């Protein structure tokens, strides 16, 4: 009783920019519907062909399977080709299991892709602070304007002096143990994320309670 | 007594300005002061006999005289305070200098209700709430040509054409074309959404002493 959530949950393209990301056996798009396409490829001579097309909701919940040019494919486009009248269709829980890894292509992409995505921009005194989109325990970086980059994962804190200098912190008994100079960073950008986290809340509320376009991303203040 | 005609000026936020009055210099400083400078015309050049430097929240106020009135010329940043300083509270400040302190003091408000607290991107249009609050101005540039300015006493209407009118009053809105009335609701949908984010926000920006949380700039161009 292995089930798709086992392995995922439903992807989230909310608030994402188109793009497309090539690699040898797939191509996976966010469209500018925000709809994620999984582009199946076979190479024919010098020439890629799309054979299958998983399109994904934009809230990952209905997978729409067809298989271009009656199974003969088209060669591949900047866009992925559009269904005709013969296609599958699928809820999440329903889709077939040798759809899974597929759909994984597609989740994992749209989890890297908010991992790099500005929710929430927040200028300091001393730093640009950056809270992206991959919540929950979502990625913030740091910029402070001296040069000095702190980046915090839900695995580990990367610190990146002006040297160029860099080492990643697995801990929170690795934390404390630093040179007191990036002990004052490192102090900033927790104040940061804390500051981002409420507004990220309390904006978050109001935008369920209004019926309107929405309140993400943001910037707030402005750079010195 | 000076609390009789204007309030203390308020120049958080503001972004660093300079201009020539007939008057005077004003300036908006980057550490968020005011300079006021008072500009004789000797020979045929400029020179400065006067300086007022106010504090950000308009409470303080330095005078003092370059030269001891002979007067430093006029350059494009402000003299540094000489040995002839004087410095007084909004209500400590002799009536000598009120006219001058509202020189600064509408400047500043000219300044806040041009300068953006709140940009707002909707389906439609592009919001923005002013900073001259109490009664903040509100812009709306619809991306299709109208223009929609909500002064708080009036409401300013541009259609694409660039045909423009004033409205002062529920009676005029009322007698407006349909298609306008579109408009001019999605501007007030606007303007509420920017007037309670504006609140939640201010609330928590006083429960968190820190760096500002305005402008903001909420959603992007479609």
């Given at each position: 009783?292995?089930?798709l ?7 989230v ?6 793009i497309?990301?090539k ?12 709809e994620?396409?999984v582009?199946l490829?076979k190479?024919?001579?010098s ?5 299958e097309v998983l399109?994904?909701?934009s809230?990952?919940?209905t997978i ?12 591949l486009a ?5 269904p005709?009248?013969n296609?599958?269709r699928?809820?999440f829980?329903?889709?077939?299991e040798?759809y899974?890894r597929?759909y994984?292509y ?5 989890q890297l892709?908010?991992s790099?995505s500005?929710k929430i921009?927040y200028?300091?005194?001393?730093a640009?602070c950056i809270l992206m989109?991959?919540?929950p325990?979502?990625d ?6 001296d ?12 610190v990146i002096?002006k040297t160029?200098?860099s ?5 929170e ?7 007191e100079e990036?002990?004052?960073?490192m ?8 500051i981002?986290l409420?507004?990220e809340?309390?904006?978050?509320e109001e935008e369920?309670?209004t019926?309107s376009?929405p309140?993400f991303?943001?910037i707030?203040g402005?750079?010195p």
């Open positions: 009783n292995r089930t959530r086992s392995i995922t949950s439903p992807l393209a909310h608030r994402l920019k188109p497309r990301q690699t040898k056996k797939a191509v996976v798009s966010i469209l500018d519907s925000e994620v396409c582009e490829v190479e024919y001579a020439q890629e062909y799309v054979k399109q994904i909701s809230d990952g919940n729409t399977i067809y298989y271009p040019n009656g199974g003969r494919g088209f060669p900047d866009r992925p080709p559009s005709t009248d296609i599958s699928y809820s829980d329903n889709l077939p040798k899974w597929k994984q597609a989740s994992r992409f749209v892709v908010r790099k500005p921009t200028f300091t005194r001393y640009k989109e991959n919540s325990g979502a913030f970086e740091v910029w402070f304007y040069g000095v980059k702190i980046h915090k994962t839900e695995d580990f804190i990367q002096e160029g200098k080492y990643t912190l697995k801990s008994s690795e934390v404390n143990s630093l040179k990036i002990k004052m960073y102090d900033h950008a927790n104040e940061g994320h804390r981002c409420a507004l809340s309390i904006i978050s369920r309670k019926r376009a309140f991303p943001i707030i402005r750079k």
